[PDB]
Amino acid sequence: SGAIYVGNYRVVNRHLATHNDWANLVWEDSSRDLLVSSTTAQGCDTIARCDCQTGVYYCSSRRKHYPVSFSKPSLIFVEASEYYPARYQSHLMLAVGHSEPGDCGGILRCQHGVVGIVSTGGNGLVGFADVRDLLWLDE
Numbered sequence: 458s459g460a461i462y463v464g465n466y467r468v469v470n471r472h473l474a475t476h477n478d479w480a481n482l483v484w485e486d487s488s489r490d491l492l493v494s495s496t497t498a499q500g501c502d503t504i505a506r507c508d509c510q511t512g513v514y515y516c517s518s519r520r521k522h523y524p525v526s527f528s529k530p531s532l533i534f535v536e537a538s539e540y541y542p543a544r545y546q547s548h549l550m551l552a553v554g555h556s557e558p559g560d561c562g563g564i565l566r567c568q569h570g571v572v573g574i575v576s577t578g579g580n581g582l583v584g585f586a587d588v589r590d591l592l593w594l595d596e
């Protein structure tokens with residue numbers, strides 16, 4: 458679990474969005490596993506606007522942060538799960554690191570701010586949904 462709170466927006470994994478997220482929907486994209494909902498309170502986070510390919514993410518299944526080198530946002534095949542059919546997920550970045558299903562929502566940050574959230578995992582792989590292209594989160 459986990460969310461980004463920026464301005465009057467909350468960014469979560471689309472597959473983990475609550476009834477309240479859907480009732481306050483701003484934007485969602487099943488191909489990116491993202492959903493943004495509106496909030497009344499002002500958010501705590503800053504979004505990175507950069508091309509960093511290294512950063513640190515929070516891994517809830519280890520209660521720890523780990524440094525990672527990750528690929529640029531790309532279209533990657535993701536196998537079927539209980540939440541989605543087998544498909545290509547867009548704007549996804551892969552890295553070598555620990556991940557378990559409940560780790561989705563952990564934040565990835567670089568020196569400039571929030572880069573994205575955990576969205577997928579493999580055997581020693583972790584995938585992050587990028588949010589750096591969503592410029593409207595800042596206005």
Ligand SMILES: NC(=O)[C@H]1CCCN(C(=O)Cc2cc3c(cc2Cl)OCCO3)C1
Nearest residue numbers: 490535538540556557558576577578579
């Ligand atoms: N974005 C998606 O399509 C998600 C939806 C929820 C499910 N999903 C995952 O990848 C969940 C996952 C499976 C794992 C794992 C880690 C995770 Cl995060 O490591 C060991 C093998 O099995 C795809």
Ligand SMILES: [Zn+2]
Nearest residue numbers: 507509567569
């Ligand atoms: Zn950066």
